[PDB]
Design a protein around this ligand. Structure first.
Ligand SMILES: *[C@@H]1O[C@H](CO)[C@@H](O[C@@H]2O[C@H](CO)[C@@H](O[C@@H]3O[C@H](CO[C@H]4O[C@H](CO)[C@@H](O)[C@H](O)[C@@H]4O)[C@@H](O)[C@H](O[C@H]4O[C@H](CO)[C@@H](O)[C@H](O)[C@@H]4O)[C@@H]3O)[C@H](O)[C@H]2NC(C)=O)[C@H](O)[C@H]1NC(C)=O
Ligand SMILES: *[C@@H]1O[C@H](CO)[C@@H](O[C@@H]2O[C@H](CO)[C@@H](O[C@@H]3O[C@H](CO[C@H]4O[C@H](CO)[C@@H](O)[C@H](O)[C@@H]4O)[C@@H](O)[C@H](O[C@H]4O[C@H](CO)[C@@H](O)[C@H](O)[C@@H]4O)[C@@H]3O)[C@H](O)[C@H]2NC(C)=O)[C@H](O)[C@H]1NC(C)=O
Ligand SMILES: *[C@@H]1O[C@H](CO)[C@@H](O[C@@H]2O[C@H](CO)[C@@H](O[C@@H]3O[C@H](CO[C@H]4O[C@H](CO)[C@@H](O)[C@H](O)[C@@H]4O)[C@@H](O)[C@H](O[C@H]4O[C@H](CO)[C@@H](O)[C@H](O)[C@@H]4O)[C@@H]3O)[C@H](O)[C@H]2NC(C)=O)[C@H](O)[C@H]1NC(C)=O
Ligand SMILES: *[C@@H]1O[C@H](CO)[C@@H](O[C@@H]2O[C@H](CO)[C@@H](O[C@@H]3O[C@H](CO[C@H]4O[C@H](CO)[C@@H](O)[C@H](O)[C@@H]4O)[C@@H](O)[C@H](O[C@H]4O[C@H](CO)[C@@H](O)[C@H](O)[C@@H]4O)[C@@H]3O)[C@H](O)[C@H]2NC(C)=O)[C@H](O)[C@H]1NC(C)=O
Ligand SMILES: *[C@@H]1O[C@H](CO)[C@@H](O[C@@H]2O[C@H](CO)[C@@H](O[C@@H]3O[C@H](CO[C@H]4O[C@H](CO)[C@@H](O)[C@H](O)[C@@H]4O)[C@@H](O)[C@H](O[C@H]4O[C@H](CO)[C@@H](O)[C@H](O)[C@@H]4O)[C@@H]3O)[C@H](O)[C@H]2NC(C)=O)[C@H](O)[C@H]1NC(C)=O
Ligand SMILES: *[C@@H]1O[C@H](CO)[C@@H](O[C@@H]2O[C@H](CO)[C@@H](O[C@@H]3O[C@H](CO[C@H]4O[C@H](CO)[C@@H](O)[C@H](O)[C@@H]4O)[C@@H](O)[C@H](O[C@H]4O[C@H](CO)[C@@H](O)[C@H](O)[C@@H]4O)[C@@H]3O)[C@H](O)[C@H]2NC(C)=O)[C@H](O)[C@H]1NC(C)=O
Ligand SMILES: *[C@@H]1O[C@H](CO)[C@@H](O[C@@H]2O[C@H](CO)[C@@H](O[C@@H]3O[C@H](CO)[C@@H](O)[C@H](O[C@H]4O[C@H](CO)[C@@H](O)[C@H](O)[C@@H]4O)[C@@H]3O)[C@H](O)[C@H]2NC(C)=O)[C@H](O)[C@H]1NC(C)=O
Ligand SMILES: *[C@@H]1O[C@H](CO)[C@@H](O[C@@H]2O[C@H](CO)[C@@H](O[C@@H]3O[C@H](CO)[C@@H](O)[C@H](O)[C@@H]3O)[C@H](O)[C@H]2NC(C)=O)[C@H](O)[C@H]1NC(C)=O
Ligand SMILES: *[C@@H]1O[C@H](CO)[C@@H](O[C@@H]2O[C@H](CO)[C@@H](O)[C@H](O)[C@H]2NC(C)=O)[C@H](O)[C@H]1NC(C)=O
Ligand SMILES: *[C@@H]1O[C@H](CO)[C@@H](O)[C@H](O)[C@H]1NC(C)=O
Ligand SMILES: *[C@@H]1O[C@H](CO)[C@@H](O)[C@H](O)[C@H]1NC(C)=O
Ligand SMILES: *[C@@H]1O[C@H](CO)[C@@H](O)[C@H](O)[C@H]1NC(C)=O
Ligand SMILES: *[C@@H]1O[C@H](CO)[C@@H](O)[C@H](O)[C@H]1NC(C)=O
Ligand SMILES: *[C@@H]1O[C@H](CO)[C@@H](O)[C@H](O)[C@H]1NC(C)=O
Ligand SMILES: *[C@@H]1O[C@H](CO)[C@@H](O)[C@H](O)[C@H]1NC(C)=O
Lengths: 172, 318, 319, 171, 172, 318
């Protein structure tokens, strides 16, 4: 949410994209299609996986401890034992609550960041051959078939090839 | 045509999950996982920790030698499970600092008892009572020797027993408090008495108190249980004029992962590092909400019921 | 062929407040809020917690039945307040494990005393002393029965008292330690009398120690106070030949939100869930710097005097 | 500070802005004015309000605890009671200090994020009819009166209406 | 890593830059050279320095504590003493691991942020006289001597001076 | 007619690996250690006043063992107890030994103002073969062994008020003879009750005549107790025999003083942090040397190393 991409200019999450987390939707003379960017998709997954590996499976081993349940009624010693455990449980619960909130806040932003980074990479790749419409879509000002649209996803898009046509359409 | 449109977007799920963040208390995400373990199998696993079910025997009752606890002799464990159904069918006993004796025995993790030969000359050994009955006959605690008079005389007792081993020896002894002064005479032929279990480092003196207590199992008298630990190179001296419930040897004290748990959960067949009084639980999640009492590789107890960690982006459905 | 200009900006405050961040120790923000409560109103509020001001009496003094504490008989509380001015104006007494008895009674939160009828045959009951004076006459602890010799004879007492209720009964008893051997004979007709208060689960034996102590209220003798708790279905047996301060009944013991606090603050009239010895404090902020001792829903005590949390952006003033 | 807008290229806070946290200052033919963007203002406020909901209140209810003040000297038992409370106080003090430092860092960044998000939304809305002068101000290359500037703030700005004029001025 | 500049479009760290942390590499008729922006360097250094001052030297003073080593066996009281110290050590150990992980995550991002801030400042300074090549490099479309390259670093670059030449070169 | 300007960051040939939230191993340009895991090996004499007990435990110096006479009326900030310590006096047992040891250590002084008690009718300055001073029979310096005078031991009722503004700590004892003949030969009475009483506290001890395991050829034992009289209180010692009388009071204070058990050398340096393993620097926030600490010390953690990133990510040229 810090970058304003997941809930920002992109106001729709494509429920039909099942092959990845981020991707491309194109409209060209040859029709409409959908694709996925695996680099950005694996980008979010690897970061989130690192948070999980740091938490899941890392349990402590404690064998002999103090009494934590008392049947009879005692004085000072029983009160101290109850206070120690109660303080310990309260402290760990705060650590759990703060950690869950922080990680989820970071998870939102890093997933938001990865979407924005994909958007910025595409914009720089298109150079002056397209314009940002403001809703997460680029209006390419040249005839792009299903080949050069794949070139933009492939990173093999040379703006010089279509620059003369694009500039002519834009400023006329 | 002469133009084209390229749109960038993210995925979304029809049914998302609500998680809590720093900014928002309720935000919807594509997917999430639980971090708090709140379910139990319902039974204690036999592995990888060596479990010992006391059934109708407490740890102290098994240590002293209650007739129903003779099956636990010289047995070791990683987690002694004490059941609420436990009772005692022997001489009524009171153990000062009961928790400490239970804790030290449980942590040691063994009930090994090497029989020793004391110089009980001049006194009658292996005393029995109607309350402690073994094989439908009058008996007593298996690890305790009830010393009474021999030929109507109770000579002053001065026995010695050195710790010739490289480990500490745990000695369990007791003092008899007769309910009536006549019972004091009928068993020890002397008025009152004193037992002083002393070592090169520790000293312990106990005075019998002859008096009527609320009779349990038709026994108005009581026995108080005490323990002594002799270190390697130390010697054990028992000075007494009567009312002495003598030890029959020493218990080996060890150091390990053993402990004690009070639960009424079944002992099943599975492999779970985490053991709780409610039953063995998985240790995949970092936190748990089953029981504050745990043993082994266990998640940390928290007051929270559920804690969902977002494993996806925000769910913004169309 | 003219133009227009659109500028975007944020707000700013003239002075602002300085807060602490991960990166910087002193950064200016537009607005912030305090998170550590370091002030108190000065008085304990009577609500919503039931306060009981001990005034001149410690909780044990009210329990035993000191004459100045008769106004606390059979009283309930959520937070008993013991004042530093409290004193004792009765027989000098010593309570082994005073803290534990004070702790469990405070947790129970009641001074209910259902008087019981023991079979005290052969002994003189309702003993009196000059140190314990009710109004202007010799008296003793109201909840304690000073059993003395009757007709120069003190036969052994072996009375019984079953616990027929479903709650545990708290019994407060004592042993008298005479200062002189004459007082030992003149009160109990014996040289030494053992006290054996026993139940089906626990047992307790006490030996009188005849000897002179530093005179408190001109009383060289002392009283040792012990307590026994009989569980439902359990029975109480008191075997004794003298020097016994017998109980007159049992105290009801419960479990709840009740506790005790040592404070000298006035008990005002307000609503504050958080109670500290320095006075009731608000429970809005997550942390406090007033006192580590708290009662009720209280902010967690921290060592910091102030911890400012920024509630706005960074302040960039124009001038 | 991560986005570098609050103290970055817009290194000037408008103290005159009292109706909102972020806004526009329209300098145009037909005069100069100031307005405030309620969407970005309420966005940052709601996030900060969310932080307060998690911190203000939520206090623990603890009735009976251990003694924390002692008149006489006892020894081992008293030492453990003092150690337990002192350890607890230090640990909670660390959590209080760390939380304030972390939240304040997040408060600075999210307010910076909201400012930057408003700036970029304006740029895409204007398309190619204006240029970022670098100080957070857009030099609109067509005659925009106090109506179409309201349209820019309204989100109702159509760049094609002025595209032919705007591009010609830039040429 | 959130901004995608240190490991993003700029995927090459200049090991030759020894005078600073961030800087400029320029090409002109006069040759190729390297420079450093000290403002962006000191911005990142101060942030990291603030984290150190909050940690280094801020030690507590504790004089008398509980016993932490026991030779004999005592039981209940000894178990409570062991439990308290082990609980305290476990809680502080968790705080140490989280603090190191959290600060290091922020250190990457704040260093990433300063890189992005330097890049965005240069783009706005160049206005419409250059185009972003997408790899952290700007293609300036006018004759820039070794002077105006210094002007871009110093902030004394007037885009209006070269705008007519730059715009003509771009759109022709 | 064109120019190109590239922006970049620095990189080092050899980076450092640090741990982040997202990644377990990420390379950065520079990092610093946060856990101190090394020690100089010796305790610094400054800025904390160290007192090396050498062959004397704190109780031995308090009681007055002949080898501990050099510690008389000495103050400290951290008493260092050595494992090589031994005792050459009458065998003694101190109930609640940890509390008395802790109480003396926290006070930080062994100041002893001698008082004049009215021990009339009894023989003072009793000596034993076990306690040897200047190759002559002696006793604890701060303790008075009261024996019979002319085969008579009158009943003792002595008084001593606390007329000062500080609490007085009194160390006294009770003698437990090994044989009944030794009890008669020293005290002329069969048993002597000792009742050290104040206006608030009272303490009564009964001697237990019996043989104990001989230490330094002494079958008899002495039990050591302490009493603290508050300002305005009076001290009453009621006794008929078997009393090891005090010779005065110890001043009790409140301060930074404590006690540490270590065998590390005492060098010359300035280190605020002191551990049993030796003085360590307090620059890093955390340490891994010893859980026992004194002074301005880093907080003990289980982690061996924790590297804090002090630079950007190292992205070297391929
Ligand atoms: C929502 O978030 C949760 C967070 O946990 C994700 O949960 C994981 O979901 C995947 C889905 O495929 C599970 O993957 C399966 O793991 C099996 C082994 O499990 C162990 O190892 C994994 C790590 O590899 C641990 O996470 C797990 O706890 C176990 O320790 C594999 O054997 C599975 O293999 C698949 O392919 C092989 C080859 O075809 C087949 O033979 C198998 O039958 C199976 O089809 C598979 O990889 C993973 O275990 C889940 N982890 C946890 C902790 O629950 C969710 O995926 C995510 N999304 C949704 C929609 O729920
Ligand atoms: C101080 O005061 C207490 C008050 O209780 C006295 O304690 C009681 O002492 C008497 C006498 O010893 C005990 O009597 C015994 O009771 C046993 C339990 O009887 C149960 O069943 C009967 C009905 O059959 C009920 O009325 C009763 O309440 C019980 O539920 C009997 O089993 C005993 O029988 C004896 O005689 C038979 C004869 O065949 C023998 O076979 C037995 O083995 C046994 O010897 C006996 O009658 C009574 O139980 C005690 N009560 C308690 C609570 O302890 C103390 O005795 C007194 N102090 C002194 C010094 O006397
Ligand atoms: C072991 O040693 C201790 C300490 O010496 C003794 O304890 C003291 O014993 C003496 C002797 O019995 C006690 O002295 C008596 O004190 C009374 C104090 O009460 C008055 O004074 C106080 C203070 O002014 C007032 O608050 C109070 O209201 C009273 O006004 C005196 O009253 C006694 O006076 C005697 O003479 C007068 C005048 O003739 C008579 O009227 C009296 O009846 C009495 O005979 C007397 O002085 C002292 O109180 C004890 N305590 C203390 C703390 O000192 C032990 O007694 C001793 N043990 C043995 C076995 O000998
Ligand atoms: C707990 O409560 C019980 C009662 O329920 C008490 O029991 C009494 O205990 C005393 C002391 O032990 C006993 O007294 C002794 O009596 C002997 C004779 O008893 C017989 O004769 C009498 C009639 O003369 C009968 O009533 C009785 O039933 C017997 O048939 C004496 O010979 C003893 O003398 C010894 O003590 C005296 C001092 O008391 C000395 O001078 C002597 O030299 C000798 O040493 C003694 O007097 C009494 O008999 C018991 N009665 C009952 C009914 O049990 C417990 O004492 C009491 N315990 C405590 C700790 O409180
Ligand atoms: C703390 O406690 C330890 C152990 O009790 C003490 O160490 C002993 O101290 C005594 C002196 O108090 C030493 O006695 C000396 O022995 C020297 C010979 O040492 C060798 O032989 C002995 C016996 O086998 C071994 O124990 C030892 O390790 C050596 O192998 C003699 O040379 C000494 O007398 C001669 O030398 C001195 C110095 O020149 C002269 O002044 C004398 O007049 C005489 O000529 C002396 O007899 C003993 O050796 C020490 N070790 C042991 C194991 O007992 C510490 O001293 C004590 N701490 C303090 C501060 O005193
Ligand atoms: C605390 O300190 C006080 C200080 O006084 C001690 O008090 C003395 O204690 C002893 C021992 O208990 C008492 O001695 C006993 O005295 C009895 C009465 O004697 C007085 O009265 C007679 C006339 O009735 C005079 O002739 C005599 O001189 C006294 O004035 C005697 O009857 C006792 O005799 C017993 O002991 C002897 C010797 O062993 C035997 O031969 C006898 O058979 C019998 O068993 C005994 O002599 C002394 O009287 C007490 N003094 C006072 C003033 O009370 C406390 O004892 C002490 N307590 C503790 C716990 O420390
Ligand atoms: C209760 O039992 C204990 C343990 O058995 C017992 O302690 C032993 O007492 C004897 C005699 O008091 C001690 O023997 C002495 O040991 C020392 C040191 O080894 C020797 O120096 C002594 O020798 C002299 O005395 C002898 C007396 O017969 C002479 O024959 C000899 O020639 C020497 O002059 C003597 O052997 C023994 O060391 C202790 N053992 C311990 C403490 O472990 C205690 O005495 C018994 N209780 C009673 C009241 O007797
Ligand atoms: C709690 O305890 C205190 C202290 O004992 C009680 O204080 C009362 O204080 C007044 C002060 O004026 C006493 O009155 C005065 O008494 C003297 C006695 O000589 C007399 O000369 C004066 O003319 C005046 O009357 C009062 O006696 C005293 N009360 C008692 C019982 O000591 C206080 O009353 C106790 N109760 C409460 C609820 O505070
Ligand atoms: C410990 O045992 C010793 C040795 O039997 C006891 O001392 C003897 O006791 C008898 C009986 O009273 C006397 O006849 C002897 O004179 C005593 N001394 C010796 C050297 O034998 C001692 O009383 C016992 N102590 C206890 C508490 O039982
Ligand atoms: C797209 O990239 C792949 C390699 O990932 C390459 O084999 C293919 O030829 C590319 N398609 C183009 C350049 O049209
Ligand atoms: C001691 O003898 C008993 C009786 O047979 C037995 O239970 C126990 O195992 C024996 N101890 C050893 C060490 O064999
Ligand atoms: C500052 O923020 C607090 C909490 O959000 C708010 O209650 C208060 O009105 C604000 N005051 C100012 C002057 O901004
Ligand atoms: C930029 O500043 C440096 C600072 O020394 C100076 O040497 C250089 O000439 C300046 N370049 C300009 C003003 O174009
Ligand atoms: C009492 O004498 C001892 C032994 O020399 C000494 O340590 C102490 O300072 C003396 N007390 C004084 C002089 O007040
Ligand atoms: C010491 O006690 C005796 C006992 O008779 C007494 O005479 C003497 O006066 C006392 N000493 C002092 C200094 O009063």
């Amino acid at each position: 949410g810090i970058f304003g991409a997941i809930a920002g200019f992109i106001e729709n999450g494509w429920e039909g994209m099942v092959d990845g987390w981020y991707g491309f939707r194109h409209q060209n003379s040859e029709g409409i299609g959908q694709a996925a960017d695996l680099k950005s998709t694996q980008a979010a997954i690897n970061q989130i996986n690192g948070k999980l590996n740091r938490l899941i499976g890392k349990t402590n081993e404690k064998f002999h401890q103090i009494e934590k349940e008392f049947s009879e009624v005692e004085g000072r010693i029983q009160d101290l034992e109850k206070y120690v455990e109660d303080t310990k449980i309260d402290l760990w619960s705060y650590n759990a609550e703060l950690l869950v909130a922080l990680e989820n806040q970071h998870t939102i932003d890093l997933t938001d960041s990865e979407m924005n980074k994909l958007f910025e990479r595409t914009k720089k790749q298109l150079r002056e051959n397209a314009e940002d419409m403001g809703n997460g879509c680029f209006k390419i000002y040249h005839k792009c078939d299903n080949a050069c649209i794949g070139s933009i996803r492939n990173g093999t898009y040379d703006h010089d090839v279509y620059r003369d046509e694009a500039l002519n359409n834009r400023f006329q | 045509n002469s133009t084209a449109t390229l749109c960038l977007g993210h995925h979304a799920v029809p049914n998302g999950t609500i998680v809590k963040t720093i900014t928002n208390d309720q935000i919807e995400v594509t997917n999430a996982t639980e971090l708090v373990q709140s379910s139990s199998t319902g039974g204690i696993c036999d592995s990888p920790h060596q479990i010992l079910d006391g059934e109708n025997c407490t740890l102290i009752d098994a240590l002293l030698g209650d007739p129903q606890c003779d099956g636990f002799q010289n047995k070791k464990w990683d987690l002694f499970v004490e059941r609420s159904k436990a009772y005692s069918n022997c001489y009524p006993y009171d153990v000062p600092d009961y928790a400490s004796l239970r804790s030290l025995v449980a942590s040691s993790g063994t009930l090994e008892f090497n029989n020793e030969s004391f110089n009980w000359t001049g006194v009658t050994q292996n005393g029995t009572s109607s309350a402690c009955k073994r094989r439908s006959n009058n008996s007593f605690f298996s690890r305790l020797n009830w010393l009474t008079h021999l030929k109507f005389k109770y000579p002053a007792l001065n026995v010695t027993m050195p710790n010739n081993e490289k480990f500490d020896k745990l000695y369990i002894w007791g003092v008899h408090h007769p309910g009536t002064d006549n019972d004091q005479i009928s068993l020890y032929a002397q008025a009152s008495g004193r037992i002083t279990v002393s070592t090169k480092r520790s000293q312990q003196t106990v005075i019998p108190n002859i008096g009527s207590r609320p009779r349990v199992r038709d026994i108005p008298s009581r026995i108080s249980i005490y323990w002594t630990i002799v270190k390697p190179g130390d010697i054990l001296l028992i000075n007494s004029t009567g009312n002495l419930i003598a030890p029959r040897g020493y218990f080996k004290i060890r150091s390990g992962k053993s402990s004690i748990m009070r639960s009424d959960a079944p002992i099943g067949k599975c492999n779970s590092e985490c053991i709780t009084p409610n039953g063995s639980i998985p240790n995949d999640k970092p936190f748990q909400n089953v029981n504050r009492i745990t043993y082994g590789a266990c998640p940390r107890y928290v007051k929270q019921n559920t804690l969902k960690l977002a494993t996806g982006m925000r769910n913004v459905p169309e």
